[PDB]
Amino acid sequence: TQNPMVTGTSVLGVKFEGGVVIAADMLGSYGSLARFRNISRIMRVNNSTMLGASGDYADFQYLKQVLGQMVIDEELLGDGHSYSPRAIHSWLTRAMYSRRSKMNPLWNTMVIGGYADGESFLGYVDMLGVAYEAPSLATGYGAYLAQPLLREVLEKQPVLSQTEARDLVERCMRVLYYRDARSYNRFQIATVTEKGVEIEGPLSTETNWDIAHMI
Amino acid sequence: TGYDLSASTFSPDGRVFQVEYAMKAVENSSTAIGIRCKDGVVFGVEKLVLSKLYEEGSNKRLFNVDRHVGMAVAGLLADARSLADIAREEASNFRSNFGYNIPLKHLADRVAMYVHAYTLYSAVRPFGCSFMLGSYSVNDGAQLYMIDPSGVSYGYWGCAIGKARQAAKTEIEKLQMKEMTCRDIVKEVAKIIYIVHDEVKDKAFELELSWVGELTNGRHEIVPKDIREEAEKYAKESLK
Amino acid sequence: DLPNEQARLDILKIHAGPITKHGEIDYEAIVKLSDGFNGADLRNVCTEAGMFAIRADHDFVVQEDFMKAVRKVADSKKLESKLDYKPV
Amino acid sequence: TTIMAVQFDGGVVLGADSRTTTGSYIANRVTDKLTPIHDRIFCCRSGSAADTQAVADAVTYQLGFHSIELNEPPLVHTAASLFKEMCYRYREDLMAGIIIAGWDPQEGGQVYSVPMGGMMVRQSFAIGGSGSSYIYGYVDATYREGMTKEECLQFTANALALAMERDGSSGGVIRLAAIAESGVERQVLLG
Amino acid sequence: YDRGVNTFSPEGRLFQVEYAIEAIKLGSTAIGIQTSEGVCLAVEKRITSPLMEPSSIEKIVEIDAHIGCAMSGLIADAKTLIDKARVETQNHWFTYNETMTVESVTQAVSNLALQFGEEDSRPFGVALLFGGVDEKGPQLFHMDPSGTFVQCDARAIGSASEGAQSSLQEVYHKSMTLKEAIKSSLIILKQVMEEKLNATNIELATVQPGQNFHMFTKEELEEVIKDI
Amino acid sequence: NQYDNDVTVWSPQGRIHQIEYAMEAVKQGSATVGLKSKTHAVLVALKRAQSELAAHQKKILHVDNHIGISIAGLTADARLLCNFMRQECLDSRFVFDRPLPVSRLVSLIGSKTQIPTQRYGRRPYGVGLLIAGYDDMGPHIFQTCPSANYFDCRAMSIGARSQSARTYLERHMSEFMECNLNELVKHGLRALRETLPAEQDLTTKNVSIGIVGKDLEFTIYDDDDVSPFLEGLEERPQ
């Protein structure tokens, strides 16, 4: 895809003690227009990992299909093994890069978060094949807006509870609702734990408009 | 002479001997049966342990093709694993392409046309494998299909494949498909799998059971053979 | 040619003869399991099921053990049924 | 050009205009925009004409062969997955504004949308073509859950009346089609 | 009964490989000996008539600078393996800038010792003797048509194989020197040849870390035979 | 014997003969014994030589950082499935950036050696693999066959007169589970000393021992690191 037709927006994610919380917003956009209001930009992969995405949405449905099959393959082996999120991140990198090398790229920016062996994992795959690991990942204009709050807090006290982490994402989605033109006031929070993958419903933010009186 | 060697030659009485030899190659393998209830499909395979040979859970003739479809193979074993990989790949094509889960009818056609497709040339040999296919979906119901090495695929309420074949399908007409819950049908299989194949031929054996239906919520898996252990609790009490 | 259904009960009555069995029985299970057999072969199946009675030290036998001895021996005869094709 | 697809209780309601624009000239007033793939499944096409004609014919082929091979009625998502595969696999050349809609025995009324990018998403009501940008506002406010069929046909009638009224590309005459178990009723209104 | 060219025996192994082993027996003989100083090597040219020029016949071609060779049986089958084994050594040197070890050469040949078939014709009818000095010292090797490659300290082949091995374990020990082994080969050769041993029948080949190269010239052999 | 011709032709008894003749090629190889504990896996082979002066042909070859295989039978096909073995290891090592469990490796050997047992003009592979490694759930000892039927055992042995090795192993299979390495290995090669005639050693120059463990990468020992293991064994009885 040389030209992304129907795009998304920013995806957030942060480690905490005993899991990783990732929350995108449910908007699909088409140029200036906010055309599709109700899509899911978070895929609940099997038990111990979780995917978010930005950019083109159709290629995200493609990787939703391909990962949806390739998990079911090792599910039907039944030897007792499963893909660690570390192992999914490497595949998704090598599948992004091998399509990059033919000038036919997948216009995406994805965050893989997962929890295995008591070790929270939070990985990143860009369109051009850039891949790294970090305690706080933000895509799109999240790297310009919400990443400063995450790296503000994680430099002060690097470990986090679940309530602090869930609250901090609500603050950053308040900011990304404020200063981004293509972000909608409706977002879903997804969380992995030692219990399993859980996707919370389409929550909303409260806003503060008290500066409008100051002419 | 000369009419039995190749697969692509008719015999003067009018049948194909390589196919007929493929039918009785599965006849030497051990008995594996199946049956469906009103809301599920119960499998059972008797497996052979002479003295030591393998760790418990080796080369399980119960497979798992799709999320909701499984095998129960008997005959030669390697070509059965080849059919497991091919039927696996066919469920991957239907799952990838048309968006919904594979019905058992299309899967029986697309596998059975391959098993037939290896009986038309002297490039290959006809397969020597026969397998069960059990499944359940709420818009579909429980179906149970039976593929022979010749390529014929059709539908049973219950079947049996092995040496002890006729004696292990004699008693299934005693059971009732229509009323019974499959949780009974588990021990109702294990009683005659314990009864058939009397222990003078082989000294010991070991049982597998795999069970898909409404109680497992579409997913096919092996029952935990330790859990409820209903088999031998009835089976040692079924000798008299 | 071969007999038909409900005619199997006819040829049955003349194969009864000397061999007798339990009062409450249905012979249809016996003869149906053996198809395309000599009249003496079915007569052997009746005696083979009757010679299983002396192992059970009873005069008659239940039809469950009957069908066992009936089905086993019958399927053993079918493997020897080759060369039934005859020129016209 | 301007197409419309609303579902209701007993099924779905489709609707489209007809006026097909090539340049600043109208070479065809009245045109079958909505197309019968199967007996219960329609698509109404937008964007380029030749591309969507070839895609709708090929989907009619594959869904026809599969639908006979089941010897069962086909699901609507079976039809939508094929437009997803053909529109996605060849997205560099095709410009398909397809909206697949139709009643189904197993699941009731469904409406799927396929924009130019090749994605697939379910909607309760769907709109496409160049003219739909002028009726986004009216279809946002006037819509309400649980409309009867006699209010759905009135609703898409006004909803295409505004788009044909304002857009210079859109025009011609309104085509409509109501789909349920009772049979597809195709009629032509104006005004 | 010409059956499958790739069919196993009742014993059983490959019919055509087992038939290929018997083709070594009618070929000319050769003698290899591993020395702590190097590897000496011997062969017989088997002059057929005084018509023929004797020095154009090759039984030793030298693969790299530092890896010798000895062929046997059908020579025209051997030449293909020679020319391609050279390409595999050069490809090793131009990916790696180091000398290909003497071991991996015979993997690189014996991985295609068995390529016969119809799709994807006959196996090779040669029994090679590889020598050479890598960093692991002077190695002496031996490969067959079956690809079953093994190190041999002092290997004979061919027609003379039984008597040459059988007589050769008696006269070999661990601390052999070079000029002892060189005149220790020609005794066996003049026992096993049918023509009179002279300057035109045999050829020696030596390869050492410190005596190189030290290839194979005439009038050395004149001094070598006259020491008998 | 006209149906002993090719791999295509079924028997009138139901036994394809080329597979049986390839099993005969398995039995002609030398003995090797693989046996596991709960915490380790040990496979021990016995080399043979062509003559006195030729070195003994090796059996155990290194494959991955945890997967090791023995061999019996043909050698070139062992290099063939060896190279396919390496390549399918470092494929998934290249893609998924994790090592492969063994139990999904061997299905590639079965589906690899399957197709040359069905189509015309393709021989099976004379092969004797005794696969050993770690997945996360411990050790595994597999075996293969030219018919491509792989067995998860606790101990097997293949090669010449290897049945005596089995009839050694069955009366110690209740005691081959808890013990650690130093007696596990000699419990291994006691089966090798029953695979031989009782009048010649059991030397140091021939036996090769391979072990795979958790804190122990797969390692092959050759006569000299073997020499600390062969010390202290019981005498063969009268």
Side-chain angles (χ1 to χ4, degrees), chain E residues 158-173 175-178 180-194 197-217 219-220:
Chain E
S159 64
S161 175
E162 194 267 331
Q165 285 291 109
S166 178
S167 65
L168 190 143
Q169 291 98 22
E170 182 68 28
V171 295
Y172 178 71
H173 53 83
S175 66
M176 290 292 288
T177 61
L178 182 66
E180 186 180 3
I182 290 173
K183 66 181 181 292
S184 297
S185 68
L186 65 94
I187 303 168
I188 305 300
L189 284 177
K190 74 176 177 65
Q191 288 182 358
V192 300
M193 62 179 66
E194 71 272 16
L197 177 59
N198 52 3
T200 60
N201 287 317
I202 60 103
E203 58 180 359
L204 296 169
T206 56
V207 47
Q208 288 85 19
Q211 192 185 7
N212 46 358
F213 297 84
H214 215 38
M215 222 160 19
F216 211 65
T217 60
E219 294 99 10
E220 298 289 330

Side-chain angles (χ1 to χ4, degrees), chain C:
Chain C
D1 298 342
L2 273 66
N4 291 332
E5 285 298 325
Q6 189 63 260
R8 186 184 307 275
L9 199 70
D10 191 12
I11 180 60
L12 159 73
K13 290 296 179 297
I14 77 105
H15 280 295
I19 172 61
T20 184
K21 285 169 292 298
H22 181 267
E24 186 277 333
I25 34 82
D26 171 74
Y27 304 96
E28 188 175 358
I30 303 302
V31 194
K32 177 180 177 180
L33 268 57
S34 62
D35 290 336
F37 278 78
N38 173 18
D41 288 340
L42 174 61
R43 183 171 175 269
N44 288 127
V45 173
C46 300
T47 60
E48 185 69 19
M51 287 179 285
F52 187 80
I54 189 171
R55 299 182 64 183
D57 66 47
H58 289 77
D59 47 341
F60 54 84
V61 190
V62 298
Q63 282 190 328
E64 193 277 335
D65 290 331
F66 277 159
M67 290 183 287
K68 295 302 292 183
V70 170
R71 174 184 173 275
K72 295 304 293 181
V73 181
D75 295 343
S76 299
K77 308 291 286 187
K78 304 304 291 184
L79 295 180
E80 305 302 325
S81 60
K82 190 59 172 59
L83 272 69
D84 285 341
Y85 53 94
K86 308 305 175 184
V88 296

Side-chain angles (χ1 to χ4, degrees), chain F residues 1-204 206-213 216-233 236-237:
Chain F
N1 55 0
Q2 71 273 16
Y3 52 88
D4 296 334
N5 194 2
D6 295 326
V7 192
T8 302
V9 179
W10 283 95
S11 297
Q13 294 177 355
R15 289 183 289 113
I16 305 167
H17 283 92
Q18 297 292 320
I19 284 92
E20 294 173 351
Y21 300 133
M23 295 292 176
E24 295 294 328
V26 177
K27 291 183 178 68
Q28 291 294 320
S30 74
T32 178
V33 170
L35 51 89
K36 66 179 183 179
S37 68
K38 293 184 290 295
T39 61
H40 287 277
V42 173
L43 61 92
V44 177
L46 177 60
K47 292 173 181 175
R48 291 178 293 180
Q50 185 60 253
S51 67
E52 294 89 1
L53 48 89
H56 288 83
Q57 176 67 40
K58 66 182 183 294
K59 292 290 189 183
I60 302 168
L61 57 91
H62 182 270
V63 170
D64 207 356
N65 293 117
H66 52 87
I67 296 166
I69 55 98
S70 175
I71 195 62
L74 291 171
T75 63
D77 293 332
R79 269 85 56 86
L80 194 146
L81 298 179
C82 174
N83 292 320
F84 180 73
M85 197 74 70
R86 274 107 157 99
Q87 189 59 254
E88 290 294 327
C89 285
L90 58 91
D91 275 327
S92 176
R93 184 61 181 169
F94 173 70
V95 174
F96 291 100
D97 201 359
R98 67 176 176 87
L100 281 176
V102 182
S103 66
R104 63 173 61 96
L105 175 63
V106 186
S107 67
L108 298 175
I109 285 95
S111 66
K112 175 70 175 179
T113 60
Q114 170 62 255
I115 294 99
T117 61
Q118 183 173 359
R119 291 183 179 176
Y120 185 74
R122 301 291 297 274
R123 68 177 186 274
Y125 291 167
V127 72
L129 299 174
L130 293 179
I131 308 168
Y134 279 5
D135 52 1
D136 293 333
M137 61 183 287
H140 299 291
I141 302 298
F142 290 158
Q143 73 177 359
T144 60
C145 68
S147 66
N149 293 320
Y150 62 95
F151 291 160
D152 190 5
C153 70
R154 60 179 58 83
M156 282 298 289
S157 177
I158 46 96
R161 63 181 65 88
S162 297
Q163 183 59 39
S164 67
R166 292 185 182 90
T167 57
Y168 179 72
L169 294 173
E170 279 107 17
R171 65 180 61 88
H172 295 88
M173 64 181 290
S174 65
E175 303 298 325
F176 283 171
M177 297 299 288
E178 291 290 331
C179 62
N180 54 2
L181 286 83
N182 198 6
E183 69 270 20
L184 187 62
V185 174
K186 67 178 180 66
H187 275 170
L189 58 95
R190 281 182 180 89
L192 272 77
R193 86 187 295 168
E194 280 112 16
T195 55
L196 289 174
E199 67 273 15
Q200 73 271 18
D201 289 332
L202 196 69
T203 67
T204 67
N206 53 3
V207 59
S208 290
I209 297 97
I211 301 100
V212 51
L216 187 62
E217 198 270 328
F218 179 71
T219 308
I220 297 169
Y221 303 106
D222 46 356
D223 306 334
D224 298 332
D225 301 329
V226 170
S227 295
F229 284 168
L230 294 174
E231 58 182 0
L233 271 73
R236 288 186 292 271

